[PDB]
């Protein structure tokens, strides 16, 4: 029994929602709210615990970038604060290698980070690792072959189609083949040994196109596009399928949840979130 969790997001302001979707029966669970609202955060799971990393709290009274790391226990329905990151990281990308959380890029006011840091739950400590070759906010992150890939994003001046790879044993970054499309705020995940980059923003329009990276051929190829154009979407993999949750299409905050079946190369709307939102953190446990 595994659930798709969605934490935070944005609709008029940053949200505290923590909701879980059960793909087997189509039900939505309303769980304990985040202590501090956040959009542009990322979610991940380590040892059956859900983590909400970074983001920013946008309120009609003012905005605050977050360096926070919070931990949710599904068995207790409780959030617990963890050690914060060295810097606030809004529009962050996160990846897990060997139970260690990597917080990648993101922004803090006028600063677009290339810095990357790693959290060890067993010690409750963050330590900086080698920074990326490019500053990246709205970066998609995927873990494949025990390497951490940072895909697309925005460097402060340009929207990116470039992507790079981190080798944890060597503590170094290398540029890989660039995507066909410039994407900032895309959903990046790994399914069947491929990295998928779905949606995002190319500097002019929100995208519905989806491309996947094959490591053996080192090429990015387009697969079937989503029904809705979306940036700042949440993304996850559950039982061999890709799930995209919410986002922003340029005017509307989507409640649509689409599901990609790699066998048929088709997307279908499987459910709707309880309300439309963008910039959510998503994870499965």
Ligand X SMILES: CC(=O)N1CCC[C@H]1C(=O)N[C@@H]1COC(=O)c2cccc(-c3cccc4nonc34)c2CSC[C@H](C(=O)N(C)C)NC1=O
Q: How far is CA 282 from the centre of its chain?
A: 7
CB of 35 to ligand X, least distance (A): 18
17 near ligand X, judged by CB under 6 A: no
By CB under 6 A, what part of segment 226-265 binds ligand X? 231-232, 248
And the tokens for 111? 């600063």
Report the distance separating Cα 176 and Cα 44, nearest Å: 24
The reply to whether 163 sits near ligand X by the rule CB under 6 A is no
In a 13 Å sphere around the CA of 93, the CA atoms on its Cβ side amount to 33
Q: How far is the CB of 92 from ligand X (least distance, A)?
A: 8
Q: Contact with ligand X (CB under 6 A): which of 5, 201, 243, 260?
A: 201
- The reply to whether 6 sits near ligand X by the rule CB under 6 A is no
By beta-carbon proximity to ligand X, the closer residue of 88 and 279 is 279
278 binds ligand X (CB under 6 A): yes
**Nearer CB in complex with ligand X: 4/280:** 280
- Find the shortest distance in angstroms from Cβ 276 to ligand X: 10
* Closer residue to ligand X (CB): 23 or 103: 103
Site string for ligand X, 115-154 (x = CB under 6 A): ----------------------xx---------------x
Q: Minimum distance from CB of 209 to ligand X (Å)?
A: 14
Give least dist CB 256 to ligand X, A. Answer: 15
Establish if 114 lies at the interface with ligand X (CB under 6 A).
no
Q: How far is the CB of 115 from ligand X (least distance, A)?
A: 16
Would you say the C-alpha torsion 11, 53, 130, 87 has a positive or negative sign? positive
Q: Do the Cβ atoms of 106 and 89 come closer than 8 Å?
A: yes
- Out of 279, 282, 284, 285, point to the residue binding ligand X (CB under 6 A): 279
CB of 24 to ligand X, least distance (A): 29
Distance CA 142, CA 152 (A): 12
When the beta carbons of 23 and 153 are compared against ligand X, the nearer one is: 153
Which positions from 28 to 67 touch ligand X by CB under 6 A, shown as an x/- string? -----------xx-----------------x---------
CA distance 282 to 109: 24
Positions touching ligand X (CB under 6 A) are 10, 39-40, 58, 91, 137-138, 154, 184-185, 201, 231-232, 248, 278-279
């Amino acid at each position: 029994g595994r659930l798709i969790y969605t934490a935070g997001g944005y609709f008029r302001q940053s949200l505290s929602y923590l909701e879980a979707y059960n793909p087997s029966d189509g039900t939505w669970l309303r769980l304990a709210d985040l202590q501090v609202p956040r959009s542009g955060l990322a979610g991940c799971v380590v040892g059956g615990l859900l983590y909400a990393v970074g983001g920013r709290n946008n309120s009609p009274d003012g905005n605050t970038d977050s360096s926070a790391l919070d931990c949710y226990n599904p068995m207790t329905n409780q959030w617990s604060p963890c050690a914060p990151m060295s810097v606030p990281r809004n529009r962050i990308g996160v990846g897990v290698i060997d139970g260690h959380i990597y917080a990648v890029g993101g922004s803090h006011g006028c600063i677009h980070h290339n810095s990357v840091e790693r959290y060890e739950p067993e010690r409750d400590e963050w330590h900086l690792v080698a920074p990326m070759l490019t500053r990246r906010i709205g970066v998609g992150v995927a873990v494949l072959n025990r390497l951490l890939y940072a895909v697309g994003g925005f460097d402060g001046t340009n929207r990116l189609n470039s992507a790079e790879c981190y080798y944890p044993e060597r503590n170094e970054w290398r540029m890989i083949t660039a995507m066909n499309t410039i994407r900032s705020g895309a959903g990046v995940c790994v399914l069947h040994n491929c990295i998928y980059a779905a949606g995002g923003y190319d500097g002019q329009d929100q995208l519905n196109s989806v491309e996947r990276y094959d490591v053996a051929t080192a090429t990015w190829t387009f697969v079937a596009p989503m029904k809705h154009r979306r940036s700042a979407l949440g993304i996850t993999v559950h039982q061999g399928r890709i799930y995209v949750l919410g986002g922003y299409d340029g005017h509307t905050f989507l409640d649509s949840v689409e599901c990609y079946d790699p066998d048929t190369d088709t997307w279908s709307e499987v459910t709707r979130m309880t309300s439309g939102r963008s910039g959510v953190g998503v994870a499965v446990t």
